[PDB]
Each structure stands twice: as structure tokens, then as C-alpha cells.
Amino acid sequence: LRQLIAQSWHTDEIRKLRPSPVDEAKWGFAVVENSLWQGVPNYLRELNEQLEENLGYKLPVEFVPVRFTSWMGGDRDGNPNVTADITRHVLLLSRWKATDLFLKDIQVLVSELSMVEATPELLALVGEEGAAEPYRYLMKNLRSRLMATQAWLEARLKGEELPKPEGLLTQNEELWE
Amino acid sequence: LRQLIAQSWHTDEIRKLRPSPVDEAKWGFAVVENSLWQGVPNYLRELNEQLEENLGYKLPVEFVPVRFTSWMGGDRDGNPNVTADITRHVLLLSRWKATDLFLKDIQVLVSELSMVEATPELLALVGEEGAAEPYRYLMKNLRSRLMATQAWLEARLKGEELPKPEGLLTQNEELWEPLYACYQSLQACGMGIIANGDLLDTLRRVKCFGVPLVRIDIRQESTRHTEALGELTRYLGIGDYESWSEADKQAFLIRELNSKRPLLPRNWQPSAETREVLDTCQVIAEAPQGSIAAYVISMAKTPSDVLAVHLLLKEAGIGFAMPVAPLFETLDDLNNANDVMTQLLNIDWYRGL
Amino acid sequence: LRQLIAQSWHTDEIRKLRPSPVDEAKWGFAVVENSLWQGVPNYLRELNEQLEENLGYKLPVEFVPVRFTSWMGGDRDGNPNVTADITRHVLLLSRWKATDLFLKDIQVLVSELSMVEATPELLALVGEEGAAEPYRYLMKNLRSRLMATQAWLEARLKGEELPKPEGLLTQNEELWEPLYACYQSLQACGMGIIANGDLLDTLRRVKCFGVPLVRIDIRQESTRHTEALGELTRYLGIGDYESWSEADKQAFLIRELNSKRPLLPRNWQPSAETREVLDTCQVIAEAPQGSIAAYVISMAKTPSDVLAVHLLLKEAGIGFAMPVAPLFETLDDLNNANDVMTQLLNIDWYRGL
Ligand SMILES: [Mn+2]
Ligand SMILES: [Mn+2]
């Protein structure tokens, strides 16, 4: 506690210059990772435990009633600094950050899913090659697919144009499935 | 809790095959990161708080009395699977892992050291360019330096040979130095509490774990050294070392240990066993100083047993003094141990080495 | 003609600085490509047409009696600027240039060998894949193989170290073989006239110039070898070679030439001069066999002069028998020459080497 307080008294930072839409877009990523990332799923577990306790049923797995959106790098009402270039940029950055957070989730999954008992349907979906570590297989495929798109956006962020990898992620269905 | 237990009941893994020295070397890295990494520095804080409370003084920052070492990928006593190639490999892997753990420490430091108040000495050390974010500067330099060496070892691990980057890390002094500089200014400039926090922890970990992460120890039986040196002598037509009495072996060993002309034939054809003894000393010699803690000689029975490894290491080209240790592990060897070392210390050459 | 003359009156270049061994090595490549490259094969065709006309027979295709060699970047007699580093460099450059000239020959061949009629033996040698354009196949393979080695030497020339490609060219046999296979089928399959045209020319150039382009010769004074071997002996505490009478020098040299234990200290500190003598033999030894034609010993006066270089080369690690040649260049040395060689041939060890 004394360390942490001291940090704040001595860790002084003070913008000298007006923040920019990217900076403000970045603070929202900070809120997303330090609180919403754990917060949403917990909210959904509690809500589900309560439904079943009090009413007798749980919402189906496919039903996620919450969605977060941001106006950062999207709102130009009255703001000349939020240009189409900035939005383009911020749009990319979000994708980069989702890749960052989704990799941490996928790593965990790649190591904890050592189950070998699987369904015809799931086995079919892999059929041989990784049919001796099925769930792990599908998590390893996704891991590469995420790592590929990450690589591509770090280039675009940098200003380089280069074709997009075969497993570029663009839709949620690609992670969901 | 139910999730965690379920994992264990369903997460079944069972080796199908004999683990390998790399695997066992890997479990030790797992112990290092899941427990020793936090454990050592805490042990050192508590010990320090107690010294000062009960006795009135704290040990100085530069004094880290604990060091961890591993025999994994270092002990070949009785184990044909621990080859000089494996040790080479494991030696590299440790360095890779230290880079991994040291980066996590350095990242933290790069963001929390936003202090701008610094000392003449520290400012000098950066002087302009980063003289507007001094401590951060030195942590960013180290970050690159670590990232560079990491990159290099992931290639070597892979089997690729490519020159080493300008900021390749090989010694603990290279991590110590900058880190210690920040500590000093922060104390000097009134930021004691920040200095004695995560910096202190990384400081202590450098000396406790450092560059190699965990130094290894090499261990081979005495018999194996006698055979390598016997095959060598017969090839040179000098005689047969494993037939000579012990006074002759020491005679031969002291003569060669003092000799300036080499003995190991440049392009020789030994047997598998001998080559292994010879290659292992080449790894020791090839490895950065401070990677290898000691050469242990299991089954040591006489003074020539210890002198034998000093000869081989000399032949392997080694620039520093490697601690050799006889391992007495029989009632008679224990019984004879004292006699064996008083003779060894009576040899003037040994005593000064 | 007026253009060409004008060029010379206005194209003035004048060295401002002393040329370097590389520059002089380069002028020899200029002679090789502007005149020897066409000249040798023409000399061989005329000589062959004459043999058959006047005597009734032609020499066999495998017999190329001419070979060109250069002393450029090989002769250090009296020249401090020709260092072992320069020779290493020039040795590489020659290989680069042979790749350059051999590609021009191979391109021609890749397009003109559209013949599809081939022999069992040749078809076997390709068997499918390129069995629908056989001769072209083998010329395309060689083309890549040459292009690969070219790439590798342009890096080494540049100072970069990177492993060598699978199809690195080092011997003339590697160019000869495929080329000779095509010749054989073309003769066998009725395409004599095509075989005896540009293929014949490249065939003869491989043996006349080959992989190294022009083998070099190394040349150092005898005195320099005596000093290197004197400094060595004093360091080992054996004595001082440049004081021993000639019978003692031969004694010492024959003993060591037969010895199985090395003599050159692994990490030694000689003087500049000695190191140069030692490094040069390491280049010779390091270089592919057939790059170096001979070691010439200017100022050779006694049998130990020749034996001295065989000892150094042995110490440098050399796997083949390098032709050593005494250079007698004084009236007395000429006068004593015969005596010097009859003693050398009376040494049984020398005679069989
Ligand atoms: Mn034992
Ligand atoms: Mn002369």
C-alpha cells in the first residue's frame, strides 16, 4: 500500500498537449481490459445463476445481451481533429487490441483443453491429424489465425500495405464457430 | 474450486515415453517461475526487516546470499541421454527463459519509472536524448538489449547460426549496472520507497538468478575420465594411463598441466564414450563464464581423479578457474577422503590453482 | 576507329595510389576473359585438327594439357601487403569470377541443347521429370547450382557468414560430370557436330580453368619459416630452432612430422610476422583442394628449408599432399641444388610423402 501510494505522489505525468482521438480511443481500451473483460462474463454468470434459482431456467449459451460501443475516434461532431484518417486508424487499433486480448484467452484454452473424448461431429471437424488432441487442435488453429491477423494489423498500423493472410479475422463468426 | 478440481480429473496427461533431459530441465524452469521468482525477493525482504528490527542494521543492497543451480541437463553420471549436445541446448534454453522473465520485470519498470529528478552521475550516464525521462531511458535500453538476445537465442535454439547482436547479454553485470544506477539516484533524489520496491526485487533476482537463470553443474564418473585419458595416451604412443600406478598418473598429469604444448590431437577419431567426455568439456569451455557452477566427479577415489578433469578442461581451452569437486560416496572413499585431500593440497601447483 | 582512339586520348585514368594485390588479381581475370577464355579452346581445336591430319589420331576429349595459374594474391615474397586475409579474399573472388564466366557458357547451352534423342544411361541420369528435354535438364540443374554458389560467394566477399547452399560448387568434377554426360549421348545418338562445338569448348575450359578459375601459388621466403618455427620452439621451451645446426633441424623436423601430438599452441600470442606465416597455411588448409597449385620457397638453401613448410602445413591441418618447391636463386644455391635434393630424396619419409 505505501509503495502504491508513493508511486502516485511521484509518478507525475501531466499532458502538456491536448490529447488526440487515438489517446482517448486508448483509454477506452484500458477500461475494456482492466474491468469489462472480467466484468461482463461475471455479470452473465450471476444473472444466469439467478434466473435458474428464482425462475427455473438459464438463458441459452448463444444469448449474450450486452454489447459495448465507443464514440472515441467516431464522434466528429464539432471536432475537426477526428478525421476520416483517424477513424480508419482507430478502427484498426481496436482490431489489434482484440487480437491481443483474445490471444490471452486462447493460450489458456490451448493448454487446458487436453480432453480427448469428443463427438462424431467434432472429430469429423478435425478428422485425423489432430484427432488425437481434438479440442486443442481447434484452439491451436485459432491461435495462428489470430496471430496472423495481429501481424497484418501491426503492419497496417505502421503504414505498410501488404496483402492479407489467408486466415485474416474479420467477423465474430470466425471466433464463435 | 469445482472448476479447478474438475480440470485435474479430466485433464489427464501420462507420459507414454521416457522424459528427456530437456523436459526435466523445463520442470525446473516451472519451479523457478511459479515460486522462486517471487519467493526469493520476499525471503530477502523479511530477512532484512528482521535484521534491522532485532539487530539494528540491514544488509547492503549488493548482498544477495542465495543462488539456485540445477543438475538438469548437467548430470550425466550414469545417463547416456545427457549428451554434450543436450547440455549445450539446455544452457541456451535457460538463457532464453531468463530473457522471458526479465522482460516481464523490465516492462513494469519502463512504465513505473516516470521520475524526472535524477543525479549528476545518472544524468551524465544518459546525457541528453533521454535526459527528459532518465530512469525510463535506461530501462528502455535494457528492454531492447534483452529483446535482442532473446531473438538470438530463439534462432540458436532452432539450429540456425547467425552472428550475435551488439547488445547480446552474457553476464549479470550487464543487467546489474543500469538497474543499480536507477536505484542510486532514486535514493539520492528522495525516492527511496520506489527504489526499494520492484527495482529491489529485480536487483536481487539478477544476482540470484541472472543471465543463465539457474547455473547448471556438470557431473561425470571418474572412471569415464580415466578411459578418455587412457585412449588418448595410447593413441599418442606415450603409454597407457589406466595401467600406471597413481604416482605415475600424478606425474604425467602435473607435467601436462604445466606444459605449453597441446596434447589433444587436432583431428582425432576417438570412441563414442571418449568423444562425449571431450565434447562436454568443450561445451563448458564454450559457455559464458558463470553458466556452469562446478564440475562434480562422482566416484572420486584418488588425487589423480581430480587432476584428471583439470587436465581435460585445460585441453578444452578454458579461461577461468572451474571449481572441481570430488564426490566421495563409499565407506572407504569417505574413510580415505581426508588422505586424498591432504595429498592434493600438498601439491604446490594444485594449491595455487 | 576515330571513336576508339579518341576514347584513349580522353579516357585518362592514372593510379594515384599503389595498386593492391586485389587489383592485380583483377587484371589477371581481365586477361583470362578477354583472351584466354577463347584462346585456349581454339588452341586445342587447331592442335587436334593437326594431330589427326599429320599423325592419324585425335587426343581424347578428357585430355586437356593446358592449365593457367596466377601468383597474384599468392606471392608474398618481399610483400607485406599480401596478407593471409588478402589471399583468402582473392581465392573467393576467383571463384566468383568463374561462376560469372561459366554462367555465360551454361546459358548458351541451356538454349541450344533442345535435342530429345538420348541414351539409356543419360535418360536414367534424369529419369522422368526432365526426360522430355534431357540435355536441357542437366544444363538447367547446373545453372542453378552455379547461381547458388555465385550468391554465396558474393555474400562472403561482402563479409557475411551464412551456411553454404546444398549445390555449392567446389570441385571441377561437379562441372565436368554433367557436361561430359551430354557430350557422350550426343555422340552416341548421332549429334557429333553439336557435341564437338560449344560443349567441347566448355568441357576444355572446366579442366583448363575450372572452379577456381586460375589456381594460385603461395610464395614466402625460407627465412620467414625459420623465424616462425624459431619463435614457436622458444615458446614451448624446447630450444631455439634458428641456432641448431642443419642436422638437428632435420632431426627435429622429422620427429615432429611423424608425431601424432600437435605442436602449435591452441591460443598463442606470436608476433605479427609469425602469425602471418601461420595464418597463410591456415588459408591453404582451409581452401578447397585444387585452388592452390604449389607452395614455393624463395631462397631455399638446405633440406630443412623444404621440411620446414611440410611441418607448418601439417600443423595447419591439411588433408592432401601439397607440392612444395625450393626456389634456388643464387649461384651457390644453384651449385648446391643437386646436393640439397639428393639428401632430401635419401630421407625415406620425404620420398614417400
Ligand atoms: Mn554414485
Ligand atoms: Mn629472390
PDB file of N, CA and C in Angstrom, chain C residues 52-97:
ATOM      1  N   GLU C  52      45.487 -35.263 -86.055  1.00  0.00           N
ATOM      2  CA  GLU C  52      44.767 -36.159 -86.917  1.00  0.00           C
ATOM      3  C   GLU C  52      45.166 -36.040 -88.378  1.00  0.00           C
ATOM      4  N   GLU C  53      45.374 -34.828 -88.848  1.00  0.00           N
ATOM      5  CA  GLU C  53      45.803 -34.619 -90.210  1.00  0.00           C
ATOM      6  C   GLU C  53      47.193 -35.259 -90.378  1.00  0.00           C
ATOM      7  N   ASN C  54      48.198 -34.763 -89.637  1.00  0.00           N
ATOM      8  CA  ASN C  54      49.535 -35.268 -89.766  1.00  0.00           C
ATOM      9  C   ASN C  54      49.789 -36.631 -89.182  1.00  0.00           C
ATOM     10  N   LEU C  55      49.247 -37.023 -88.046  1.00  0.00           N
ATOM     11  CA  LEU C  55      49.529 -38.306 -87.454  1.00  0.00           C
ATOM     12  C   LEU C  55      48.399 -39.297 -87.522  1.00  0.00           C
ATOM     13  N   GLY C  56      47.148 -38.976 -87.703  1.00  0.00           N
ATOM     14  CA  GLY C  56      46.134 -40.026 -87.796  1.00  0.00           C
ATOM     15  C   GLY C  56      45.321 -40.254 -86.569  1.00  0.00           C
ATOM     16  N   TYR C  57      45.365 -39.337 -85.592  1.00  0.00           N
ATOM     17  CA  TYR C  57      44.558 -39.572 -84.388  1.00  0.00           C
ATOM     18  C   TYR C  57      44.360 -38.264 -83.648  1.00  0.00           C
ATOM     19  N   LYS C  58      43.284 -38.191 -82.894  1.00  0.00           N
ATOM     20  CA  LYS C  58      42.965 -37.011 -82.118  1.00  0.00           C
ATOM     21  C   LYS C  58      43.118 -37.363 -80.631  1.00  0.00           C
ATOM     22  N   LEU C  59      43.578 -36.443 -79.787  1.00  0.00           N
ATOM     23  CA  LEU C  59      43.696 -36.735 -78.359  1.00  0.00           C
ATOM     24  C   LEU C  59      42.273 -36.959 -77.878  1.00  0.00           C
ATOM     25  N   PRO C  60      42.052 -37.703 -76.813  1.00  0.00           N
ATOM     26  CA  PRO C  60      40.731 -37.970 -76.289  1.00  0.00           C
ATOM     27  C   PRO C  60      40.165 -36.718 -75.631  1.00  0.00           C
ATOM     28  N   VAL C  61      38.856 -36.573 -75.588  1.00  0.00           N
ATOM     29  CA  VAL C  61      38.181 -35.438 -75.010  1.00  0.00           C
ATOM     30  C   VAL C  61      38.585 -35.104 -73.603  1.00  0.00           C
ATOM     31  N   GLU C  62      38.870 -36.113 -72.795  1.00  0.00           N
ATOM     32  CA  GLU C  62      39.269 -35.944 -71.418  1.00  0.00           C
ATOM     33  C   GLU C  62      40.681 -35.419 -71.254  1.00  0.00           C
ATOM     34  N   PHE C  63      41.449 -35.238 -72.322  1.00  0.00           N
ATOM     35  CA  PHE C  63      42.804 -34.762 -72.150  1.00  0.00           C
ATOM     36  C   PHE C  63      43.027 -33.302 -72.449  1.00  0.00           C
ATOM     37  N   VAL C  64      43.040 -32.428 -71.457  1.00  0.00           N
ATOM     38  CA  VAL C  64      43.299 -31.015 -71.620  1.00  0.00           C
ATOM     39  C   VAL C  64      44.677 -30.672 -71.077  1.00  0.00           C
ATOM     40  N   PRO C  65      45.727 -30.653 -71.906  1.00  0.00           N
ATOM     41  CA  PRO C  65      47.062 -30.391 -71.434  1.00  0.00           C
ATOM     42  C   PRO C  65      47.454 -29.022 -71.017  1.00  0.00           C
ATOM     43  N   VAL C  66      46.552 -28.032 -70.940  1.00  0.00           N
ATOM     44  CA  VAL C  66      46.976 -26.697 -70.539  1.00  0.00           C
ATOM     45  C   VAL C  66      46.256 -26.324 -69.239  1.00  0.00           C
ATOM     46  N   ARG C  67      46.832 -25.555 -68.372  1.00  0.00           N
ATOM     47  CA  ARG C  67      46.283 -25.106 -67.103  1.00  0.00           C
ATOM     48  C   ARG C  67      46.921 -23.696 -66.871  1.00  0.00           C
ATOM     49  N   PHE C  68      46.180 -22.708 -66.403  1.00  0.00           N
ATOM     50  CA  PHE C  68      46.699 -21.383 -66.102  1.00  0.00           C
ATOM     51  C   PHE C  68      46.681 -21.197 -64.585  1.00  0.00           C
ATOM     52  N   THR C  69      47.672 -20.528 -64.036  1.00  0.00           N
ATOM     53  CA  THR C  69      47.804 -20.325 -62.588  1.00  0.00           C
ATOM     54  C   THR C  69      48.239 -18.885 -62.402  1.00  0.00           C
ATOM     55  N   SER C  70      48.089 -18.304 -61.224  1.00  0.00           N
ATOM     56  CA  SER C  70      48.460 -16.944 -61.028  1.00  0.00           C
ATOM     57  C   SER C  70      49.195 -16.791 -59.708  1.00  0.00           C
ATOM     58  N   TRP C  71      50.092 -15.798 -59.621  1.00  0.00           N
ATOM     59  CA  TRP C  71      50.815 -15.590 -58.398  1.00  0.00           C
ATOM     60  C   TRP C  71      50.177 -14.373 -57.711  1.00  0.00           C
ATOM     61  N   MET C  72      49.167 -13.785 -58.400  1.00  0.00           N
ATOM     62  CA  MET C  72      48.531 -12.586 -57.867  1.00  0.00           C
ATOM     63  C   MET C  72      47.710 -12.888 -56.610  1.00  0.00           C
ATOM     64  N   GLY C  73      48.076 -12.271 -55.479  1.00  0.00           N
ATOM     65  CA  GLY C  73      47.466 -12.509 -54.205  1.00  0.00           C
ATOM     66  C   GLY C  73      47.983 -13.836 -53.619  1.00  0.00           C
ATOM     67  N   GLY C  74      49.046 -14.431 -54.145  1.00  0.00           N
ATOM     68  CA  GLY C  74      49.648 -15.680 -53.740  1.00  0.00           C
ATOM     69  C   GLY C  74      51.134 -15.476 -53.405  1.00  0.00           C
ATOM     70  N   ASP C  75      51.779 -14.553 -54.033  1.00  0.00           N
ATOM     71  CA  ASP C  75      53.170 -14.264 -53.821  1.00  0.00           C
ATOM     72  C   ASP C  75      53.358 -13.239 -52.739  1.00  0.00           C
ATOM     73  N   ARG C  76      53.946 -13.650 -51.613  1.00  0.00           N
ATOM     74  CA  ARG C  76      54.131 -12.587 -50.573  1.00  0.00           C
ATOM     75  C   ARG C  76      55.639 -12.381 -50.394  1.00  0.00           C
ATOM     76  N   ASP C  77      56.405 -13.111 -51.207  1.00  0.00           N
ATOM     77  CA  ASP C  77      57.849 -12.912 -51.075  1.00  0.00           C
ATOM     78  C   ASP C  77      58.199 -11.455 -51.099  1.00  0.00           C
ATOM     79  N   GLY C  78      58.670 -10.808 -50.079  1.00  0.00           N
ATOM     80  CA  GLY C  78      59.030  -9.407 -50.078  1.00  0.00           C
ATOM     81  C   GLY C  78      57.840  -8.484 -50.037  1.00  0.00           C
ATOM     82  N   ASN C  79      56.602  -8.953 -50.011  1.00  0.00           N
ATOM     83  CA  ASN C  79      55.461  -8.086 -49.988  1.00  0.00           C
ATOM     84  C   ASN C  79      54.514  -8.188 -48.804  1.00  0.00           C
ATOM     85  N   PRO C  80      54.736  -7.294 -47.851  1.00  0.00           N
ATOM     86  CA  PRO C  80      53.907  -7.221 -46.668  1.00  0.00           C
ATOM     87  C   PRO C  80      52.489  -7.021 -47.110  1.00  0.00           C
ATOM     88  N   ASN C  81      52.048  -6.259 -48.058  1.00  0.00           N
ATOM     89  CA  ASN C  81      50.637  -6.142 -48.443  1.00  0.00           C
ATOM     90  C   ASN C  81      49.928  -7.398 -48.859  1.00  0.00           C
ATOM     91  N   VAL C  82      50.612  -8.521 -49.096  1.00  0.00           N
ATOM     92  CA  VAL C  82      49.880  -9.733 -49.479  1.00  0.00           C
ATOM     93  C   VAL C  82      49.774 -10.571 -48.186  1.00  0.00           C
ATOM     94  N   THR C  83      48.663 -10.299 -47.489  1.00  0.00           N
ATOM     95  CA  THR C  83      48.392 -10.973 -46.237  1.00  0.00           C
ATOM     96  C   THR C  83      47.539 -12.187 -46.431  1.00  0.00           C
ATOM     97  N   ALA C  84      47.448 -13.028 -45.380  1.00  0.00           N
ATOM     98  CA  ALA C  84      46.615 -14.224 -45.494  1.00  0.00           C
ATOM     99  C   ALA C  84      45.183 -13.808 -45.765  1.00  0.00           C
ATOM    100  N   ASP C  85      44.774 -12.658 -45.238  1.00  0.00           N
ATOM    101  CA  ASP C  85      43.418 -12.129 -45.472  1.00  0.00           C
ATOM    102  C   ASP C  85      43.233 -11.818 -46.965  1.00  0.00           C
ATOM    103  N   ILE C  86      44.227 -11.129 -47.553  1.00  0.00           N
ATOM    104  CA  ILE C  86      44.107 -10.870 -48.986  1.00  0.00           C
ATOM    105  C   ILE C  86      43.962 -12.146 -49.790  1.00  0.00           C
ATOM    106  N   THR C  87      44.790 -13.144 -49.486  1.00  0.00           N
ATOM    107  CA  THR C  87      44.734 -14.402 -50.277  1.00  0.00           C
ATOM    108  C   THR C  87      43.392 -15.050 -50.141  1.00  0.00           C
ATOM    109  N   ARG C  88      42.885 -15.037 -48.907  1.00  0.00           N
ATOM    110  CA  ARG C  88      41.570 -15.648 -48.642  1.00  0.00           C
ATOM    111  C   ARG C  88      40.559 -14.992 -49.610  1.00  0.00           C
ATOM    112  N   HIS C  89      40.588 -13.650 -49.577  1.00  0.00           N
ATOM    113  CA  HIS C  89      39.761 -12.805 -50.387  1.00  0.00           C
ATOM    114  C   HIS C  89      39.924 -13.140 -51.862  1.00  0.00           C
ATOM    115  N   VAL C  90      41.179 -13.004 -52.354  1.00  0.00           N
ATOM    116  CA  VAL C  90      41.391 -13.337 -53.763  1.00  0.00           C
ATOM    117  C   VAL C  90      40.965 -14.728 -54.083  1.00  0.00           C
ATOM    118  N   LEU C  91      41.092 -15.690 -53.182  1.00  0.00           N
ATOM    119  CA  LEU C  91      40.707 -17.062 -53.524  1.00  0.00           C
ATOM    120  C   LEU C  91      39.215 -17.132 -53.843  1.00  0.00           C
ATOM    121  N   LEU C  92      38.467 -16.344 -53.078  1.00  0.00           N
ATOM    122  CA  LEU C  92      36.999 -16.284 -53.198  1.00  0.00           C
ATOM    123  C   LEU C  92      36.601 -15.619 -54.515  1.00  0.00           C
ATOM    124  N   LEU C  93      37.154 -14.426 -54.765  1.00  0.00           N
ATOM    125  CA  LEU C  93      36.948 -13.665 -55.962  1.00  0.00           C
ATOM    126  C   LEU C  93      37.146 -14.486 -57.227  1.00  0.00           C
ATOM    127  N   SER C  94      38.193 -15.312 -57.301  1.00  0.00           N
ATOM    128  CA  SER C  94      38.397 -16.137 -58.471  1.00  0.00           C
ATOM    129  C   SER C  94      37.156 -17.015 -58.663  1.00  0.00           C
ATOM    130  N   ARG C  95      36.690 -17.580 -57.547  1.00  0.00           N
ATOM    131  CA  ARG C  95      35.522 -18.481 -57.642  1.00  0.00           C
ATOM    132  C   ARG C  95      34.295 -17.725 -58.105  1.00  0.00           C
ATOM    133  N   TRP C  96      34.228 -16.467 -57.633  1.00  0.00           N
ATOM    134  CA  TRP C  96      33.119 -15.677 -58.073  1.00  0.00           C
ATOM    135  C   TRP C  96      33.227 -15.480 -59.599  1.00  0.00           C
ATOM    136  N   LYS C  97      34.419 -15.064 -60.048  1.00  0.00           N
ATOM    137  CA  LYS C  97      34.532 -14.852 -61.479  1.00  0.00           C
ATOM    138  C   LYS C  97      34.335 -16.102 -62.307  1.00  0.00           C
TER     139      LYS C  97
END
